[PDB]
Design a protein around this ligand. Structure first.
Ligand SMILES: NC(=O)c1ccc[n+]([C@@H]2O[C@H](COP(=O)([O-])OP(=O)(O)OC[C@H]3O[C@@H](n4cnc5c(N)ncnc54)[C@H](O)[C@@H]3O)[C@@H](O)[C@H]2O)c1
Ligand SMILES: NC(=O)c1ccc[n+]([C@@H]2O[C@H](COP(=O)([O-])OP(=O)(O)OC[C@H]3O[C@@H](n4cnc5c(N)ncnc54)[C@H](O)[C@@H]3O)[C@@H](O)[C@H]2O)c1
Ligand SMILES: NC(=O)c1ccc[n+]([C@@H]2O[C@H](COP(=O)([O-])OP(=O)(O)OC[C@H]3O[C@@H](n4cnc5c(N)ncnc54)[C@H](O)[C@@H]3O)[C@@H](O)[C@H]2O)c1
Ligand SMILES: NC(=O)c1ccc[n+]([C@@H]2O[C@H](COP(=O)([O-])OP(=O)(O)OC[C@H]3O[C@@H](n4cnc5c(N)ncnc54)[C@H](O)[C@@H]3O)[C@@H](O)[C@H]2O)c1
Ligand code: NA
Lengths: 426, 426, 426, 426
């Protein structure tokens, strides 16, 4: 039984002043007015073959929030409105911003729960004054309540589209809800991320949460416990948009064709606010761990020792101001075929990072809202498709193969309406 | 009921002295003696999840001919034995050839049914003297019969691994078996390819036929009629090994992610005997048509006009002696995402052409032998996976998506033993 | 004695409505008004060390026409004014065109001497009606005279910046001025190019002529004879802007480091009006011959047989609408070092063709005007630097090495003012 | 007055067991026997135009040591002979090693002056037991004396071809010979490199010294003082073989064509013993500083602020075992032309590092020997051509432009025999 998508959906974005957030916002406002097309959006454009073999838009098969019913808001450490912030990001042409300037200028960031130590390269001013991690939680819950009431929203989704936080490991404080709350109250600044405070607030307020950065946040037993108790879906993490998208397509190719891999080198140059943050090696590490993780379970080295027994995998990210938002990736893959003979594949992907990630953020938001109305909660395995590091508990492995991930999306969608695929190939 | 793989399989290769043929041969002889591994071979290495969820090697699920039971022979316009021909091709190191030298030297090409006009840049003289296309057929049937008897083969498969022939269109003479035979007898050398003579002979002699080049041959109503009458499988065409393999992996990626494509340019440089032939524009055309054909049914431009309504697709092949057998591909793909913003992907694939195609030729041969023992005949749709231009009749469309093609392979294999997939994801 | 640059210079451009012509025009108008910088212009920006070791701008060492004293006009088969033509070409942003719109709109093409057969893929109709090649000459001389009088120009230069014409060989009619005139009068439309009619008219009217395309035109004994009789400079041919620029830089590198070259493959993709024309193989050939010619005299294979005795050199140009004016080049160079061991260099040059060629066209024009005021005539060897196929008579070889070519420019400039280089390194 | 090259030259290599050293050795032994060609060697293959315009081999213009008169030896921390070490390095085919195996096996490394702290990733055993830096000096002088006597060498050259040492800055101890000696005696392990001990020993023993790594060593006032006092030439540093060679060719191209540069990103992957050492960031730094230094003096940002006022330059080196000795470089250069419009150049250079550097090491050795016999001493500015970081005192700037560097080589060679260039272009 799926609750219908009635009334307005508040989409509250952490980092609402960021490149990805503003691009998603501009694209949504323009798309719903017929001034642009939501290219790259599964929710808006993709179709599926149904049990009776009819081909339908996914949006016509399950009840999603209509773009016209979305109201955007959120938090940032810079006070600039969505228009000012989009002008700064330099992703979109002025004529695209101008077409929705009226609406953009009216989207204003609330002050952020921020800790300088977690993103050292940023120096914004628009930050809450907040006694403890737990005070951050309480202020954020207030903001959600205020926003819902002021904008007449039936439901909310909270999307983290803010900066990559410093690397931190799993620890004792993350192992249960009680321990996490205690650490929040003691103001444990080392194990409690700002992001965890927004996630807690979101779940406490019946709002699905999406982690679009590679941050340790909802991938902890404490959050699995809380989200399940509250009947809230959590999804993550790290939008899979460009270089990693490609990696989770070519690795399946080598696997499907039983070709061996000796090595895979991946590098990137980018010069945006994302890149500025990632220039701190501590923040780099968080991205690196995520990027590195996507091939092992595809190859399965223990099962195919003669193909993948010895893959040397290395990823690098380089701050490079000339590229701005347009991350450029270069990959070199050393493979081998018949009789062990080696070959090389070079890929140069000239991305527009925020262009690629904008529809992915929209899709995660709209599918998260659907998941809750469909009675789903805890880790949304079915949304692995959208993410570099698909969240999983200690009894499950992440699935990384894009094509298998897409099948998982379709399977859950069909299941939601009590249907099966019309045949194996669909 | 699948007939068991007893006794010896004769594998008769048209172009047995060629780069792909000798590479497949060397690798098979070495593999079966434990001097090399058949990397790239689905038949030898790939596994599948079965109905009860056990994972097994395909070769342990269906009865295939054991490598030890294969005997190689075939035809070429050059008289060199398989050792001399492998040394000429320069694909494999001498240390690899040396390990199986005695067996290679014993593989000697029978004189070919050849027409200089169909492959003008070749000037070998190990050719039959044959008054008519029909006499070519009869001599080829004799050779098959002689080989089976001399080598004590229970069954035969004929693999065309010879040069790409000049472009010719579908014509009246191809539209029924009666018309094709008539044209053979009248010696119509403009509509009857040499390859059609080998295909006819193979089918007439109860031998599955595989077209590993892009030649018009078994993709005609005449051959669909004949193969059905004789209960023989036919498969083709054009081994999908390198640049085109990649095309049928990336195009599914763009499709799965709802990314638009404005254009796709593919070029390559190669300096082998394959390249010598393809330097004739007439022979180039045959390859070009095949390479061009692989994206339309993936994109479906009529269904997604806003993504793929206007793809400019161009392929080039350039003779380049320095590369030898190591074809080098360069591709530039112009794509667009959210709100129509353009991006570019450049792919540089340093192929070893014959290394990539060798396991594909082996797999087509072994699966063709299985298909016949399993009572299958006519167009082997299930082997689309191995081919750039999957054969199809006028009531079916080719499927090009590698991942879907792999599912087609598994589905037929499961069906052969009366099983279903354990679940949608398997 | 160099005649001073007084009064106005008429710069009459064949193909004044083309991508390169309009880009040069816009940039000159904007530069002189301080709305842009003439990046890439030797005349505007380059310096030289003088005999007394002072470093000066070239424009301060020899008397050039000031940008403010240039008046543009010319011919095209499309009647669009320079503004409309610049908007069509899509090289420059509207904000750049807007700054000089009034001046651009006032530049209007005179009807062209055109022969459809020489550029078949173009179908403009702003063409003269002219019974014979000779009548073309006379009408073009009239246009030059009219323009000089109407715009109060002291001097004129004629720049061919129009489409690459079909390949034609040197022939009897080109071997003397008398024979060329005879062929013009007999209306021999097979050996007399339209471009030859513009060149004749320019020379007849005391106007230096620059061939910016690879056309057979002023590289004939007839034009060497005429330009000498009239004391007019002629320069050419084919602006060296992008891929070929790089070729004449890397080949000197391999030479200077005594590295061998086995092969060099050059391809590109472009979708502009240039590309439309070059899609005709006959027009392609003209470009191809020019691009192929630039390495032999650098390598000197007869002198260094062990390095360059066997270079396989191949160039391709591919029409590709998605690229528009932004030609994209890909090169693969196979080199070898110590003990013959091979290595590879891949170059991907994302050009803006008209951006690269614009300053080159301006420099050729301004240096040609200087050359005549300095009493120079016939083949301007010293301007080889700007050209893919430096013009030369039957007793001289072209010099292709960019760095040597630059030295040739400086040497002539120094000589013009009776100076020597201060030292060998300057 | 040039002393003739009589008798045998001892070429003593620090790191005689290394990839570059063994490649140079094998190539020299094979070349002098006509079993291979010394491709890449200026000394062996390059010609020059002389004052009377005759073109001659440099080796026929100045007296160099004949390859037949070279005797190789040196030091390493691994005791393996030159044959064993070359087999380990995997640069050269076995058939090339086999052809000179007899001579190679007879080249045995003397125990090294080594300090683990300066190259932490190496753990060889074949190291001297040496009380102090000064004891290292005295033992090394003994080794040189012993070698000269045992092999009947008239002259010696010492070539450092050993591992890149950790970064260290210039300091007080380097500022005079007296201070350097004092620091050596006090065993100042922090400011005195092992390399400095070999350099001191070489100069003390009348042997020119070449620094083929980027190490601080002879680029100190102390060594300038000593080398001048002893009348010994010193040259360095860091062979310029591959990616940096290219950088000092393309930067001159942009300069010569007045094109602006916004950025230049350079990365590398390599998996050899060199790469193992450079995996330590301290050792990386030494290479990085050297690689970064080569463009500033080419561009001259203060002179051309509108072209080069703001170049973002970044270099990376990545350990990557699959590449072995075959370093692979990728560069992205952001340039701009006319009216400020941006363009991009991508270079992928698949090097064989030791193949490229072997002739450079030979040339520096043979030219160093010539320099001394020609009465030259101190910093050999004229050998800048061969080096990434041309050594210079505090009153001189390095020249990096390859083409200018080549002219400097020719100028010194001509000067040595009292000749001038025949003309400016030669
Ligand atoms: N762009 C892509 O293709 C892509 C792909 C993978 C993941 N991501 C991740 O998405 C996130 C956003 O990307 P972006 O390019 O928009 O970066 P951005 O820096 O432009 O946007 C992030 C915004 O979050 C703000 N912010 C940081 N910490 C905050 C806090 N505690 N509370 C509120 N606001 C905060 C920043 O001030 C900034 O405005 C990053 O983590 C990035 O790595 C993006
Ligand atoms: N190599 C690959 O990766 C690849 C990819 C696509 C398809 N193919 C196709 O496979 C075929 C074989 O490729 P290859 O590289 O081994 O080429 P090859 O030139 O080495 O071909 C094999 C042989 O075919 C022989 N031959 C030609 N016409 C014949 C005839 N009528 N009868 C008998 N023998 C004949 C030739 O003499 C040659 O020795 C070609 O058509 C090629 O285009 C190969
Ligand atoms: N763009 C570059 O970087 C580059 C490099 C090499 C050389 N070139 C050559 O420069 C020329 C101009 O290049 P473009 O990109 O501006 O091309 P374009 O097609 O935009 O050319 C300019 C114009 O020439 C006109 N034209 C053709 N024939 C004519 C005739 N007989 N009389 C008068 N006008 C005529 C066409 O109508 C067109 O508008 C081409 O031949 C091109 O190959 C340009
Ligand atoms: N390969 C190239 O193209 C290239 C280019 C630039 C510079 N270089 C530099 O040249 C040097 C040698 O390069 P390689 O590839 O042969 O590396 P390598 O590691 O193969 O060779 C260096 C050798 O020196 C030895 N060694 C180290 N410290 C020593 C000491 N104190 N005394 C004696 N032996 C010592 C090592 O054990 C090793 O055998 C490195 O500094 C490298 O960075 C080489
Ligand atoms: Na890197």
């Amino acid at each position: 039984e799926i609750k219908p998508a009635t009334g307005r959906l508040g989409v509250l974005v952490v980092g609402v002043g960021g490149a990805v957030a503003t691009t998603m916002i501009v694209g949504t406002l323009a798309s719903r007015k017929g001034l642009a097309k939501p290219i790259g959006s599964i929710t808006q454009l993709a179709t599926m073959r149904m049990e009776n073999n009819e081909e339908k838009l996914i949006k016509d098969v399950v009840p999603l929030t209509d773009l016209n019913d979305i109201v955007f808001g959120g938090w940032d450490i810079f006070p600039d409105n969505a228009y000012e912030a989009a002008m700064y990001a330099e992703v979109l042409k002025e004529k695209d911003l101008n077409g929705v300037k009226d609406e953009l200028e009216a989207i204003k960031p609330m002050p952020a729960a921020f800790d300088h130590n977690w993103a050292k390269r940023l120096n914004g001013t628009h930050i809450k004054k907040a006694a403890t991690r737990w005070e951050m939680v309480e202020q954020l819950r207030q903001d959600i309540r205020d926003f819902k009431a002021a904008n007449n929203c039936e439901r909310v989704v909270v999307l983290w589209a803010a900066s990559t936080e410093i690397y931190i490991p799993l620890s004792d404080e993350h192992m249960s809800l009680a321990a996490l709350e205690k650490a929040m109250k003691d103001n444990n600044t080392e194990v409690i991320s700002p992001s965890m405070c927004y996630a807690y607030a979101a779940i406490a307020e019946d709002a699905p949460f999406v982690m679009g950065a590679p941050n340790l946040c909802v991938d902890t037993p404490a959050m699995w416990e809380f989200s399940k108790q509250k009947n809230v879906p959590i999804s993550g993490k790290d939008f899979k948009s460009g270089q990693t998208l490609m990696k989770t397509v070519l690795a399946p190719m080598f696997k499907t064709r039983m070709l061996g891999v000796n090595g895979w080198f991946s590098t990137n140059i980018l010069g945006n606010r994302d890149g500025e943050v990632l220039d701190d090696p501590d923040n780099f590490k968080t991205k690196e761990v995520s990027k590195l993780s996507v091939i092992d379970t595809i190859f399965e080295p223990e099962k195919y020792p003669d193909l993948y027994g010895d893959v040397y995998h290395k990823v690098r990210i380089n701050y490079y101001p000339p590229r701005k938002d347009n991350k450029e990736a270069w990959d070199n893959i050393d493979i081998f075929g018949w009789m062990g003979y080696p070959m090389e594949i070079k890929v140069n992907f000239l991305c527009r990072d925020s262009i690629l990630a904008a529809p992915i953020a929209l899709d995660l938001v709209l599918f998260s809202d659907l998941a809750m109305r469909a009675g789903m909660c805890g880790i949304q395995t079915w949304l692995s498709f959208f993410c570099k590091s698909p969240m999983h508990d200690f009894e499950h492995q992440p699935e990384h193969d894009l094509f298998t991930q897409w099948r998982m999306v379709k399977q859950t969608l069909r299941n939601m309406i009590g249907e099966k695929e019309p045949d194996y190939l669909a």
